Structure formats: C-alpha cells, structure tokens
Design a protein around this ligand. Structure first.
Ligand SMILES: *Cc1c(COP(=O)(O)O)cnc(C)c1O
Ligand SMILES: *Cc1c(COP(=O)(O)O)cnc(C)c1O
Lengths: 396, 396
C-alpha cells in the first residue's frame, strides 16, 4: 500500500536544521532556526513560567478533559490582550476564543472552519511570507494568492504596489495580515497605513485574518496591537490566530488561540459551534499545561509583572543586536549600507544577500541562514558578532 | 460572511454533559462522560505522574520545539509497549512513531496521511462504534462503511456476521479494529478469533488500522496487545493509533501516538516523511509536557513499577464494579439477567436499555447514560450502587 509513496520535499526551515547536525565545525553560527536566544545562545524557560509550573504542580487535582475550546480563563485573558480591557467587542460578546495547539494550529482550525462553512475560496498572503502559510491553507483546499508587499530595492513596504495588487481581490476573499513583526521582512505598516487598510478592507468586503505570533516584540504589548485594533473598530467580522510560543518561550507546549468575531453574540455563537465541530474531528480538545501556564501568569498581578519585564528584556536585546550588527559591519568595512535593518522589527530581517552568498557563508564559514537571506537577529550575541560580520564582509 | 452559518448538531457524548449542568438535583449519577473515576467519584492525577512532573520541573531547561514526530524516547518506549521488547518489527526498523495530540489526533493524522498519499477510499468501522470514528474519517474525505459486530440478542460478538460483512470489503480498503476494550460494547475477540482475522486480512489484502486507547484495562499490558501482535506477525503494513489518555490519566495533556509499519525500513522512512508533512500543516509539532511525562515514567524502573501498580488498581476496580453491579441488580430483584456485563471488558458496556428507559432514568432519577444504553462502569461506586440499581429496576 505504501509501495510507491514519494519522499516529501525538505522543509525550507526545519530541514536547514539537519545541515547543522552533520557540520561538525566548532564555530558554527545558527541564524535560521526561528526561536529566541539569550546572550548565552540558549533558549531558557522564563522565570514567570517556572513559578507558574510550580503553582500548577501543587494545585492540579485532575487531568480531566478541557472543553473543546479549552480553558475559559485563557480565552478572556487572550481577548483582553488583543482588543484591550474595555474593548467594545468584549462587552457586546462579539468574540469567541478557542485554545489551540499553537499558532499554526489556530491557522489550520480557521482554514478548516472557512472551507467547510463559508463560500471562501481564495486567501491572500503577502509576498514574501512565512512559507507555512500557503501550505496550511492549501491543505484545507483553499487557493492562496499573493499581493506585493516588500520593496526589494529600498528595503521598505511598497504601500502602492500593495494596494494595487489587493484590488484584484474580490469581496468574500480572505486577506491575511501579520499583526506585527512581519515574517520574514520585519517591515510592518505604520498606524496610518493600518487605518487606510482597515477602510479599504471594509469597502472591498474582505474577511481579515490576522496572524499575531509576535505581540510584544515590536514596540510593546499595547502598541503592537493597534493595527489589529484599527481593523476591529470598523469590521463586523474577523479572525485572529495568535500564538504564545514566542512571547512566553512556550514553543513545545503548543499554546495558541483562534478568536472569531462576528456582528453580534447571537451570530458568533452559531459560527463558533461549527468551529468547535472542526476541532472535534481534529484533536478533540487542546493540551492544558501550556495554556494553563499562560492563564495563571496573565491573571496574577505579581507574576504578570515579572513576565512583562522578561518580555521587555527579550525585546530590547533584539533591538540591541540590530544596532550592534549594523555598526560592526561598518567597523569591519562592509560593502554597502545595512542601516535598514535598524528600521525593521522582531527577530527576522532580510539581509539582502544572494542565494549564492548564503550558500558561501554556510560552506566556507559555518554561518547558517535561510537561502532567502532571512537571518534571525536573536541568534546574534556580542560573542559571535565579530566572527559573523567578518564572514559577511568576505562574501560582499 | 458568517451570515447564515447553521448551528452544529449536539455531540452524542459531549453534549450530554451540559444536561448535567442544568440539572440541579443532588443525587445525580453520571454514567456518560467517558473517563475513569475512583471510589470517591473523582478523576485524580496518578502519583507516578505527579512524581514525573516534579522531575520535569527541576530538569527542563528549555521549551524549544520538539521535532515534528515528537520526543524520540516516547517513540521507542511506545513501540516496545505495543510490539514487545524483542519484537522483530523494531529490530528491522520497520516502524516509525509520531507523538500526536491524543489518540483522536493520531486518527486524524492517519486519515490525512491516507487520503493524500494512498489509493484508499473506504474505511470499515464496527457497528456499533465510537461515534467520533466516522466523523474523523469523513472529515478527511474517506467514506466509512460498517461491518456487523455486536449480537444485540445474545450480548456477544457475532463472529459469523462479522466475517460475512467483511467479505464485501475489497483489497486496498482500510479496516479499523479496536485493540481491546471495544467501545462501546466492551466485547473483544478471543485470541483464536484474532488469529483468524489476521489471516483473513492478509488474504483479502486489507490495511489494518488499530485504535488502541485502553491498553491495560482488559487483562493487562501484554495480554491486551496479543491481538495487535497477531496481526503484526503476518502483516507487511499496519497503522496503530494509540492513546495514553486513559492508562495514564493524562486526558487533557493530549498524549497519543500514530505508529506506521511497512515492509522494510527503506519504505517506512519514505512513507513517514509524508506523514510528517501531514503533521507540519496541521499543528506543526506535538505538545511536550504530556508525552514528556509518559517517557519519563516508562524509561525509569522505579516509576514504571508504581504506574503499573496504579494501572492495575484501576483495572481491578472496574472489574469489581462489574460484579457489584450485577449482584445488586439481582438483590433489588432486577427483571432479567445482566450477567453478560461480567463477560465484557473496560469501562463501557451496553446495558441493553431502550432509548425510552434511558430517557426515563435521567428525567425521573437523575441517572445519566448515553441514549444508546452505554454506561460507564467506572462511574459506579459502592456508594451509588444501590440508588443506581433501584432506579434501573424501576424502569424494567
Ligand atoms: C512562529 C509563527 C507562528 C506560530 O507558530 P507557533 O509554533 O505555531 O505557535 C505563526 N505565523 C508566523 C508567521 C510565525 O512566524
Ligand atoms: C478514548 C478513545 C480514543 C482516544 O481519545 P483520546 O482523548 O483522544 O486520546 C480513541 N478511540 C476510542 C474508541 C476511545 O474511546
């Protein structure tokens, strides 16, 4: 039966990891991956999280199933984080949230929900975009189209081209937006550009789907959400797929959420039932541990203060490395200008390196990056900044 | 967009729970649910599990992503549990295992794998069967057919009818088998019937898919696996979807596994890559906590001894309640014979009650059971055995 099944193609990111396995050279530098690293080059467990797992270990008295939509506390604490404490969306009960196995899980759930309960046929993703986006939606039977976004020449958001390709999008189509810290360009819209997109969106009749996986890594918790909040102010219906993998360092516990917003509570409750049905035939109910931790931290004043501070330390270290990277490049006498990376947000940025330069950095310097030129700034430390930069200057 | 989405039908089991919410009567008795209860009527966390979560809390130093197939230790410890320590399947590297979010998750993964990489079109499930079986496979686009299994009149396995309906199954079709503790009849094949099915299976060219969610609840760990091991001895290819929700009391941590077996390692590795691809577009990687616990217990001699003993206490309590139930019924002067429930295994058994009797027990006695007459024996205690039985005698 499995006679002639063809081997699956190597993943553009996960497969890159294997190459690191074989390479036994000492000084290797991993700028692919996709997770946070600290000065040491490690991916530790947050203190707030350890304290939370302590609490759960002494209070849990059962591991009985969670409802299909997960922990109720996790849900409202998530909606407050996304829309704001006094948000009208919450007061009118226009939103429902399902705890999901990661942000990726929220995307699949949304995709299954849409393909089986709506007339949606096309989804628009930015160019470039996190490769897994197209895969998840295609897997659900939806076609994925692309809209201009990145200006390769000026290393900026080509707002015009963006708007010009979105016009080809009909009413009823889904348009996916990265909430903040766009993956992989690291270029996000300005608040005014967001407002312009929210209006244009309401006119054309698009269904907005926000992928919010890095809230807190651009400017801050509240600041990073004004984009999504601008859309939510004018939209009748929305879908937000969020993740806590990064801002909590809970990657392997698979902690995310899919929030559905409709015109009124009557409607959202009805649409949500079908979303719960989509989940029932997938994994049945979400894993508790990871979500349990998040809820505990967010609902406890003390613990929430510690976490916010820890989040801030992560945000600033990345902002540090961005500056230390540009400067060292000049110090080593890098060819052209790289100051544009200081204008970008989050862990990722396009280095502007050619496929061949990436290939040369890896083969001749053990420096690992995605063929696209995407580098994970969080993988840079004061220790490897010099050997790293020197190698880059060698391939320019 | 969510304008006229129709409400989803109530789930046959999960929806029954709500009725318990509204009912405020004190003496209620919940025999639906589907999880284990102890003398107290609670669903505690195993001691072995608490000790394991203790260990993980002091040793975990990162929450970095697990590989798509999860924790490697979890995988081999699972294959040893299923096939036996010296199993030839393991020595020849003919099996690959993916850690999945629950047993339900393993089923969806298998379904997605089959619908996208094989010629499979039909899946055969027993009649009756765990309702969610049909849903999961239909969701993947496969059609589900049924084969006779339960003899409603004699409360036994109608082996003949079983064989007669399976003949209508063509080569290339998938046949699903409950490893042990059949849900909901509680009737399993004898070892000789298993061997007869394994042979018949190899001749007809069926692809066996075992749903193994209750290993350890019938006779014991090793005993409960001789069925699956009988098939694995003669089959080139198999698929086992197992769960640790029950024998570990880890329901909400979603801990399961999907094992793929092929003719040789070369082939299984190729087929597995596509299975990893199916997982990549679903939830990406499995949650660690739950699986981490299982691996820790199974690989530690001391802890594994404590868990086995705890498993045995669960198995025997259920065997106790089965006897205490039949006897009390006679004591209360029940109408007919119920001795057949002592011949059945696991937490479930068909009481042989009519839809109307079930409805009457619930409305007039707060006694809750599935409309099908399925009762969860693990929900009976020495405390509620009398009020329970009296009510049953009232509706006979
Ligand atoms: C990291 C990321 C996610 C979420 O991934 P998690 O493991 O699933 O929760 C989603 N979208 C993008 C663009 C991401 O970079
Ligand atoms: C309980 C059960 C499972 C597995 O469920 P879990 O929550 O998903 O792991 C699978 N099949 C049957 C028939 C079951 O009763």
């Amino acid at each position: 039966m499995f006679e002639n099944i063809t081997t699956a193609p190597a993943d553009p990111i996960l497969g890159l990891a294997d190459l690191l396995r074989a390479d036994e050279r000492p000084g290797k530098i991993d700028l692919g991956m996709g997770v946070y690293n600290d000065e040491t080059g490690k991916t530790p467990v947050l203190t707030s999280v350890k304290k939370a797992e302590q609490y759960l270990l002494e209070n849990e008295t059962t591991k009985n199933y969670l409802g299909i939509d997960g922990i109720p506390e996790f849900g409202r604490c998530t909606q407050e984080l996304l829309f704001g404490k006094g948000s009208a969306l919450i007061n009118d009960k226009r939103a429902r949230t399902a705890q999901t196995p990661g942000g990726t899980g929220a995307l699949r759930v949304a995709a299954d929900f849409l393909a089986k309960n709506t007339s949606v046929k096309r989804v628009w993703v930015s160019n470039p975009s996190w490769p897994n986006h197209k895969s998840v939606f295609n897997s659900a039977g939806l076609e994925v189209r692309e809209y201009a976004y990145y200006d390769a020449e000026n290393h900026t958001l080509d707002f015009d081209a963006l708007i010009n390709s979105l016009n080809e999008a009909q009413a009823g189509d889904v348009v996916l937006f990265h909430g903040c810290c766009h993956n992989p360009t690291g270029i996000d819209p300005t608040l005014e550009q967001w407002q312009t997109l929210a209006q244009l969106s309401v006119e054309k009749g698009w269904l907005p789907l926000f992928d919010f996986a890095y809230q807190g890594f651009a400017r801050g918790l509240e600041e990073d959400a004004e984009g999504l909040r601008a859309f939510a102010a004018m939209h009748k219906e929305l879908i937000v797929a969020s993740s806590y993998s990064k801002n909590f360092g809970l990657y392997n516990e698979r902690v995310g959420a899919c929030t559905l917003v409709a015109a009124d509570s009557e409607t959202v409750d009805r649409a949500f039932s079908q979303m719960k049905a989509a989940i029932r035939v997938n994994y049945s109910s979400p894993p508790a541990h990871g979500a349990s931790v998040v809820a505990t931290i967010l609902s406890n004043d003390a613990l929430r203060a510690i976490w916010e501070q820890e989040l801030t330390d992560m945000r600033q270290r990345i902002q540090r490395m961005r500056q230390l990277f540009v400067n060292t490049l000049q110090e080593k006498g890098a060819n052209r200008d790289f100051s544009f990376i200081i204008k970008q947000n989050g862990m990722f940025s396009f280095s502007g390196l050619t496929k061949e330069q990436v290939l040369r950095l890896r083969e001749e310097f053990g420096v690992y990056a995605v063929a696209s030129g995407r580098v994970n700034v969080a993988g840079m430390t004061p220790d490897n900044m010099a050997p790293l930069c020197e190698a880059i200057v060698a391939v320019l």
